[PDB]
Ligand binder design. Structure first.
Ligand SMILES: OC[C@H]1O[C@@H](O[C@H]2[C@H](O)[C@@H](O)[C@H](O[C@H]3[C@H](O)[C@@H](O)[C@H](O[C@H]4[C@H](O)[C@@H](O)[C@H](O)O[C@@H]4CO)O[C@@H]3CO)O[C@@H]2CO)[C@H](O)[C@@H](O)[C@@H]1O
Lengths: 207, 207
């Protein structure tokens, strides 16, 4: 995050803008993105640890920054699958593969987290995704009865729990650096949400 | 051995015609029903094992048959909480509690199972209830990729699984006698269904 380094290879793909595994839609068509190998994605034993992170990637021709929107299933350790507009900046498009170096960097964003409540969520079971986060989200907990409960991060880039209780939810997020922030999310319905929805958050990870 | 009676105590109550734990509503008011204590309800480590079963109950003044619609949360082992139209037939209501002996009997019904697919159910997660069954439903399994998958019975008298797959769902049910029957339910919804729905079945337990 502050400092980090990875060696590997990039190729390029047209997928990941819609229907990517991390459910980060919609992604603007001009956005520089990448899919990420499973080993590096699940950093620290957390599924989709690096989902929605940003990477600076260096190729033979220069450097660029990409947003991580999708899983790269066949990728070895260190391997990335870039969007054409990113690959173009750091490599020769006449090559189908290039040597790269990359690192998690701070998100080029502004403002606070946004939360996405997956359809089917309720007090009984909920999947909560964090968006617009400056650094990878390693951990998400919510308070219930004076105790802090850990949520499992899923392959689809949402933190899940059961019996979260009623009322608004106090949550806290931990980034890849170990930085902790806290926030409150509106209450979950008694019955599974007919549709997914976003809710504005009020914190951000530190610079 | 064969078909033992269970000794216990009965009380009476007007609840269970509506809002019963087993979600068997609506129950017509002329029906003889009972709530049942949790130990006897959860026969075989299976939650709501006796839900929607029928019991013959003998009290000091006679015998009658009742439909099990609800849980008797505070009930001791052996205990039943009957509807008063049932209770009156076997005991004197001026006494609050009576000595009984009871046993599961074949349901006085006809026709096939009727399935109820709980609101919220999809191919991702489904809760499927069996109604109109001649004997307690101890087991429900569905087929996927040529394998049979056990579905956990819940306190609310539905069998539950996840990732049930696509296409029509081949299911099999097992009763308290060990009898197995097989049926087919049409494909589950693409995503969470906002209302519970009904699927008339095409099989019944033998007898
Ligand atoms: O038991 C008490 C209580 O429970 C209620 O039923 C709950 C279940 O307890 C709960 O586990 C169930 O959770 C489902 C959920 O409905 C689905 O929406 C969700 O589907 C996910 C899927 O898991 C993902 O992999 C996929 O990618 O996305 C979808 C969603 O977008 O999966 C979970 C898995 O269990 O939800 C039920 C609530 O409707 C009963 O209704 C209630 O009567 C009981 O009192």
């Amino acid at each position: 995050a502050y400092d980090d380094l990875h060696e590997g290879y990039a190729t390029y793909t047209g997928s990941g803008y819609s229907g990517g595994a991390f459910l980060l839609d919609p992604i603007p068509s001009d956005m520089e993105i990448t899919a990420i190998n499973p080993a590096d994605l699940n950093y620290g034993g957390v599924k989709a640890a690096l989902a929605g992170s940003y990477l600076e990637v260096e190729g033979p021709k220069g450097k660029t920054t990409v947003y991580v929107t999708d899983l790269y299933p066949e990728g070895a350790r260190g391997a990335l699958d870039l969007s054409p507009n990113a690959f173009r900046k750091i490599g020769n498009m006449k090559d189908g593969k290039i040597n790269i170096k990359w690192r998690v960097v701070k998100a080029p964003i502004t403002g606070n987290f946004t939360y996405r409540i997956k359809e089917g969520s309720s007090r009984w079971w909920a999947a909560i995704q964090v968006r617009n986060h400056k650094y990878p989200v390693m951990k998400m907990e919510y308070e219930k009865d004076g105790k802090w409960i850990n949520m499992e991060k899923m392959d689809y880039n949402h933190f899940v729990s059961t019996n979260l209780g009623t009322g608004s939810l106090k949550v806290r997020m931990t980034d890849i650096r170990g930085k902790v922030v806290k926030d409150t999310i509106p209450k979950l319905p008694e019955s599974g949400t007919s549709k997914a929805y976003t809710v504005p958050g009020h914190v951000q990870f530190p610079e």
